[PDB]
């Protein structure tokens, strides 16, 4: 063994994986990160060796983007996985790979409303039936299945309310209903929740959200079990056109080396946050899966490695207008703005800036209320952060 | 008015809006270029001025990109222009919005074969009807519209045949059918032809190919004639997660700038190489819209403004094998690769890379003999390219 | 000779070394463009092995940056040619590695006005006498040189006054006298004239203007026309830290592949403008290399290839006022800024933007007038540049 | 006030700063980043309005390097900060700056090799003194100041041997004898120690290093205490065309993000590597501020804040052949490469590679013995890190 091999029989730990997975020093020159394929098409050696050195077209396959490709399969321990122009477009792929008409798709009543809205808006028009349910339940996942049913779809913590899905018990009825468990753990990340294993057989990231970290890029990932999946997922999205570029390959390559970190001190963070507000009498509610009043407390505590996150919400006394008014009186270093993960700490509301499309009976009924607040906490002191909530509160 | 301003009243001419489309100095800093919106959230005044200032996440839409939509709807004279992360994702954009189940499209048969293939594979799994036909004869189309058709889907120049459609014409037909007319002007470019002139309703250009012309980066847009199009193409953007990225934008910005004087060395590039092959005693046939045997000669002049296009074809005698030994043995300058449009000079031979997925009997249908070729000429000195094409055909 | 060869003992013609100039396709994966080094520091195989592969550390050397230098001394003709972060640094780093205290540098007087400051207020300070004279009679600069002499830095066509020098006859005698010559030749380009081909030792560019083109990035370049005086301005780069970035020289091996059609534009529009100039009334005096009544016509035409350059001044009748109504009512497509070189007109004022540091009786005896005007031509219709310029003198 | 506002009469605390000093977002837009001002030149209102916007050219200004300059002030505790192309180009420029011929400058013994380098070959050609002094003792400082001396330029910890200087102290002497205090604190970064605070007049960093801690980017920063020495450094920046590009601006923007999270990752790493080394029977002397062997461990619990950072070195029983054997067999995850700072942890031998430009009899007189080693500890699983230097060890 030399310098530039790792020991044989090894395995690296997880942040060595972080900041080495899928990437080592350019063969030709050394260089010590992956060297940026800003690059549409790859010149052939012959008509007989075509794709002899692995490219052809930067839609297809893109040297940058396949270092990113096989970093992010290391970190959530699949097969292989895919990178996609957003975390949109990847969910978008698996609807057009695995759905057809007359089939039915499970989803978590509480997914991110762009989930939502494209299964409602888009693809209910070729006669695929979405059914929206409470994922808390197993069990309600399990009585809800159909025998058209070929796509269970999860997302923990949802966006924004944060109710968890036992993802290890819906895996298990999957499996012995065949049918395909995909699970969006973008609030998650896979240094707290690796869905791939607990026996999920796709996994969507936003890379845009906690990947990136730094509100730089947007990206999309898919993570699949198997070599089947995978190449499903390859193929289709070589047809759709909407893979990441090799820029935007470049800075996620760069950021995923600082997730464990920037993880950790966002929730600790949004621990001593969610600790603070529950005691604030201006708070109605809290939901933080780390505090102990958290009502899914106990698949929290079997489900989350490390953390419970960096994002939280609340409800405000004196319902719309209180809420309305301490947004509007959040000072920096706050952003009031859409988007999460970031090392800048964001508030949003999702009443208006994310679920706006949603009746509000539909708002109500799935617990986006009235006064409700979605935090995503930063890297900044956590005393500044405490300190600018303390005030828009006592303005509220 | 003053420094800074257009003098009210004046259209600028052809050539200044590739410079100068689209953008403004920065009413910031002055900075001449538009900067690079390389972010993904915008925050808000207040909840009340939600979205005052134009942005809220750049997935929905970014002001680089919108930059770029602006000078691109201003060269293809449209209302407003979507830009994506490839041509494929503008033309899969087009698909998914104007067709639902039991819609029929029809479909230029010598379609760029990735067309042909996000058709045949994936929409008709939607019981969608595609049909392919010979759009050289508007009354082919005419003939094959049904009640059901909701698009006829017009390329021209074709890849790789060259053939040409009658834009005007089918046009006409499809006002007269109210179906709408979705042109494929990626060969032809909007410097020689722009089907909005020509009456067509949609127009989809992979921009990766003369737009960029560097072989840097990836593109699609869409520029649509009317806003109820428009507003229709942006919708379904933001669902399907496939915009363009601001660093790709930003590079399309920059050398759309050349687009004008590139095309005319490439075309007068072009016109030199076609006539020579057309008297070498290897070469079987030619077809070059600028030399007197093109068998639609009459519409290249109707249709074709200021150049005939850096395209061209031909067939090398003694079939498949002599094809491949002219290949192996093309030299520098040339690149041996797909794609095409850009400044370096390619040549490819479809029957055995761009379209090897269709069946040989199909191929010949198609017009893709077995010795034929396309060649994309670049900016190089044109005596370097055809001594090379010289050597390559000695060896044939 | 295969695909990915030259054919043997041909030199390729000049157009086609402005496409692929330095670069060949990465032996990696055959990416058609340079890949982009975006990275500090290059591992090492072994300790014996160091630099074995040609990297060690980007502020040394990077392989984006050495492309370029490839491309940019094959294109100007010399031994060698070094990249910095901008034509400034470039100048800059020859002045600190040829003049120690004692020593005599020759100027042109007309330099640009940033070469003239460096030197008066900081080389000086160092005891090295910088003397600036004409150089519009070689025999000037016979007689001008001292025994202290070292140095004879030539600029020509010479910012803002477009005073030219005469390379061959200035490098035949300073190879007589045993003196360093040093031509910058920015405004020009070696498209139109190329210094080493006329003797001199050493050309500096300014990238930013006519290589980059699109006001896109700074950067400047040294070529030597010896491996000795190549090797003496690497090391002392080096030492001063002021390489160019890997990106600046992606971008600028992107834009140099149209130099040539750049220029071949710029300077039509600059012939047609310089003639609309000098017929109208209210214009006092036109400078343009290319028109009849240019005093230096006949060294023009010795030392001009092609063109006559992007480049041209002009004086308003009814001095300062005039002058200054007329630049504040330029519209767009005129851009009123610093700099020059781009596909963007631009229409700059010396007295206030590039020369004001210059007392005005000094301006006055180096041409720098009342009137003047320094007018950078670029791509657009020329129809509207001549339109615009016309409004703005009828506003005068 | 109202969201979007800092709360006047608070200071953000230090993590704060690092997240959002020098940056709101944008004006314009709303975008929560800075967007990259890729251009050369920015246009101006009125040849009155001249510079009312805040920009001319960005060799003298950009507004994306400003907003780096001004959070590093921030960080740093200085007036204001220029930014360079490398930490090279900042030295430079303060030596270019601040000595004239006849001037005297005492530097560290134990400087970085590239500040000795461009003091002793190329500004010592200036008739400039530089003498080289061991900056351990502060009264050395105060003995060997002459009439003559203008800039004492002190590094701490030193590069390669992390010898300490005791910045108050020298502060001190400097105040005294009215001479200009320079620090190089890059080692350190100012989540350690702050030269600012402690009486230096201006601090020195390589940007490169620990600002971008992810091997991206090379980059310089001159942070200076007055008005008037960073009025002095900004003029001659413009002159020297050595200012940092956008683009690297941008990068570094995001990376002094994490820089807190990062150094404190690196350094509870470096603690337990340091205290691993100490007890490994291969290894005969360890050095690092964070164990009791250190031999200023006064002063490092005076000067250090936080961490006692990254850095760590040692030496290999067996001289030069051991520690030859041992970096030759050190296992990924390390880095056999120059530069230090970075996410990934890098080794190297200085004498036979950063300092073997220095007489092995120098070498040994400033503390490079021939087995020392220079550990730049990264945020891998220290695991790992550990695994490898035992087994490299065994080697020895
Ligand atoms: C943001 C988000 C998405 C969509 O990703 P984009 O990158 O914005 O397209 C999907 N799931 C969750 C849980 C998300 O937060
Ligand atoms: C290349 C091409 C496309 C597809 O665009 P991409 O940018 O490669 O996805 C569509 N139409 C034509 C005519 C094409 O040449
Ligand atoms: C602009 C210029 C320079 C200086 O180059 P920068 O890239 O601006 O530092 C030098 N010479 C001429 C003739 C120039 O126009
Ligand atoms: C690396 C370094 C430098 C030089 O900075 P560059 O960015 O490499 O030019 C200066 N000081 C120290 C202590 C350094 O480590
Ligand atoms: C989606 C809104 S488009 C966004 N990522 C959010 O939840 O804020
Ligand atoms: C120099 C001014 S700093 C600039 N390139 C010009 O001549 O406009």
């Not at 994002?311 to 947004?327: D, P």
């Amino acid at each position: 063994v030399k310098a530039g091999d790792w020991l044989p029989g090894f395995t690296p730990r997880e942040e060595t994986v972080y900041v080495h997975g899928g990437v080592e020093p350019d063969p030709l020159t050394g260089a010590i990160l992956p060297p940026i394929y800003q690059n549409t098409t790859f010149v052939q050696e012959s008509v007989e060796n075509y794709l002899s050195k692995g490219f052809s077209y930067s839609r297809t396959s893109n040297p940058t983007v396949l270092s990113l490709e096989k970093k992010i399969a290391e970190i959530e321990g699949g097969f292989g996985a895919c990178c996609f122009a957003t975390g949109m477009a990847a969910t978008v792929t698996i609807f057009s790979a695995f759905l057809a008409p007359g089939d039915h798709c499970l989803v978590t009543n509480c997914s991110y409303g762009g989930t939502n809205r494209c299964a409602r808006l888009h693809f209910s028009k070729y006669n695929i039936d979405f059914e929206f349910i409470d994922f808390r339940d197993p069990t309600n996942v399990e009585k809800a299945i159909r025998p058209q049913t070929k796509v269970v779809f999860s997302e923990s913590p949802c966006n924004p309310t944060l109710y968890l899905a036992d993802i290890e018990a819906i895996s298990q009825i999957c499996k012995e209903k065949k049918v395909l468990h995909v699970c969006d753990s973008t609030f998650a990340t896979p240094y707290m929740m690796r869905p791939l294993d607990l026996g999920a057989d796709i996994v969507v990231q936003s890379t845009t959200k906690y990947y990136d970290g730094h509100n730089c890029t947007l990206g999309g990932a898919v993570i699949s079990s198997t070599k089947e999946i995978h190449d499903k997922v390859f193929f289709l999205r070589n047809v759709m056109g909407n893979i990441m570029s090799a820029q935007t390959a470049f800075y996620t390559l760069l950021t995923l080396k600082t997730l464990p970190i920037r993880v950790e001190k966002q929730s600790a963070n949004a621990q001593k946050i969610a600790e603070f507000l529950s005691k604030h009498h201006k708070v109605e509610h809290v939901i933080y899966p780390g505090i102990p009043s958290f009502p899914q407390k106990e698949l929290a505590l079997k489900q989350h490695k490390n953390v419970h996150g960096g994002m939280l919400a609340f409800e405000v006394k004196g319902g719309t207008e209180a809420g309305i008014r301490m947004m509007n009186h959040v000072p920096r270093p706050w952003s009031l703005c859409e988007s999460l993960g970031a090392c800048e700490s964001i508030i949003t509301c999702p009443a208006v800036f994310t679920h706006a499309n949603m009746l509000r009976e539909d708002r109500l009924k799935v617990g986006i209320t009235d006064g409700f607040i979605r935090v995503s906490v930063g890297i900044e002191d956590v005393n500044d952060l405490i300190d600018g909530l303390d005030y828009a509160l006592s303005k509220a």
